[PDB]
């Protein structure tokens, strides 16, 4: 009998985010707190970084980088913009403006947001009813 998933989610944020049920439960908790943008931004960067830089998907990667910049960086109100360093935001903005869209261009912002999650919402999620009750009666 294998170690149940909820125990791996308590090992690391990475294990939690590798599991469809854990992603859904973590995102629920963030929605209750008004921080779901942290998790969506985090997944958006991964989605972007895996696209192969080639001339055939250069429009695709460009609108995608623009969409991530527009939704999570440009928006000075949102939680992602307030939790990433100003120099990191200007750097990303530079890449967008000059159209230098290298696959790792969001990686440091993603690292800052990941740190934000491991410092507050991820430990809080592990003390939450959403998680603890999935532990008793989950499917």
Curated annotation (Swiss-Prot):
Signal peptide: none annotated. Residues 12-135 form the RGS domain. It is found in: Cytoplasm; Nucleus; Membrane; Cell membrane. Coiled coil: none annotated. Ubiquitously expressed. Phosphorylation and dephosphorylation of AXIN1 regulates assembly and function of the beta-catenin complex. Phosphorylated by CK1 and GSK3B. Dephosphorylated by PPP1CA and PPP2CA. Phosphorylation by CK1 enhances binding of GSK3B to AXIN1. ADP-ribosylated by tankyrase TNKS and TNKS2. Poly-ADP-ribosylated protein is recognized by RNF146, followed by ubiquitination at 'Lys-48' and subsequent activation of the Wnt signaling pathway. Changing residue 30 to R: In HCC; uncertain significance; somatic mutation. The modification Phosphoserine is found at residue 1. It is linked to Hepatocellular carcinoma: A primary malignant neoplasm of epithelial liver cells. The major risk factors for HCC are chronic hepatitis B virus (HBV) infection, chronic hepatitis C virus (HCV) infection, prolonged dietary aflatoxin exposure, alcoholic cirrhosis, and cirrhosis due to other causes. Caudal duplication anomaly: A condition characterized by the occurrence of duplications of different organs in the caudal region. The tankyrase-binding motif (also named TBD) is required for interaction with tankyrase TNKS and TNKS2. Homodimer. Interacts with ZBED3; the interaction is direct, enhanced by protein kinase GSK3B and casein kinase CSNK1E activities and decreases GSK3B-induced beta-catenin serine and threonine phosphorylations. Component of the beta-catenin destruction complex, containing at least, CTNNB1, an axin and GSK3B, that regulates CTNNB1 protein levels through phosphorylation and ubiquitination. Interacts with CTNNB1 (via the armadillo repeats 2-7). Interacts with GSK3B; the interaction hyperphosphorylates CTNNB1 leading to its ubiquitination and destruction. Component of the AXIN1-HIPK2-TP53 complex. Component of the beta-catenin destruction complex required for regulating CTNNB1 levels through phosphorylation and ubiquitination, and modulating Wnt-signaling. Controls dorsoventral patterning via two opposing effects; down-regulates CTNNB1 to inhibit the Wnt signaling pathway and ventralize embryos, but also dorsalizes embryos by activating a Wnt-independent JNK signaling pathway. In Wnt signaling, probably facilitates the phosphorylation of CTNNB1 and APC by GSK3B. Likely to function as a tumor suppressor. This is Axin-1. It comes from Homo sapiens.
